[PDB]
Chain A
Amino acid sequence: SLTFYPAWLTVSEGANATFTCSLSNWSEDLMLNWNRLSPSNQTEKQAAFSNGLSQPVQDARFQIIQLPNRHDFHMNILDTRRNDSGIYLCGAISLHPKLKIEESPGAELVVT
């Protein structure tokens, strides 16, 4: 399963925001996305981690950084903007032996 913490994060505009996505009992082949919930509660992709590389969908402030010797990942927003405020989550996919998606619970970011 996946967890995503802290459950609530408040930072001043311009400061970094860091969430941790933590994967339990996952295999070596990690494919992990960072998503944000829209006002309608639809998921929107922010960044992707695969191979051992993070890539942002369009904003390079969003980086997924694997932690030392863990299936734990920092989801960093560098230099936050007030309109980054919202609910975020992480999701992971395995393609073998069976297709599965796991989602973390949401975590809320407030940028003041």
Chain B
Amino acid sequence: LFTVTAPKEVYTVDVGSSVSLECDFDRRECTELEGIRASLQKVENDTSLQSERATLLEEQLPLGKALFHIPSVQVRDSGQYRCLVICGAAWDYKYLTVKVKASY
């Protein structure tokens, strides 16, 4: 019954600038008893691994947001990601899309 939602699902960014991506989760299904972990994974095929480019702004977690930051966006950062939250045994994810504007 733990679930993740993505009220913001599409994000826009200019090459050279940073992008933030986020998904929200149901906190009354997460305590510090079983731990909380969040990850962003770029979709490159059927299996995803942790993004090398993104980091987690973990100060947002107690507010029920998994907020990710990718600095210095390049064209190859375009496309779909899975925003994943794990609370003890329970997990869920949402797809997020990054749209990039490249200039010169």
Contact = CB atoms under 8 A, between A and B. Distances in A.
Interface of A: 1-2, 31, 33, 40-43, 45, 48, 50-51, 55, 57-58, 91, 93, 95, 98-105
B11 interface: no
Across the A-B interface, give the 8 residue pairs with the lowest CB-CB distance, nearest first.
A50-B89, A102-B47, A101-B48, A45-B92, A45-B3, A99-B50, A103-B46, A57-B1
Given A40-B9, A50-B89, A98-B49, 19 more contacts: A31-B91, A33-B92, A41-B95, A42-B6, A42-B9, A42-B94, A43-B93, A57-B3, A58-B1, A91-B93, A93-B91, A99-B39, A100-B47, A100-B48, A101-B82, A103-B47, A103-B48, A104-B46, A105-B46
A102 B2 CA distance: 19
User: By DSSP majority rule, is chain B's interface helix, strand, loop, or mixed?
Assistant: strand
A26 to B, nearest CB: 11
A43 B46 contact: no
Given A42-B6, A45-B3, A51-B89, A100 B49 contact: yes
Interface of B: 1-4, 6, 9, 37, 39, 41, 46-50, 82, 84, 86, 89-95
Contacts of B95: 41-43
A40 B9 CA distance: 10
Contacts of A57: 1, 3
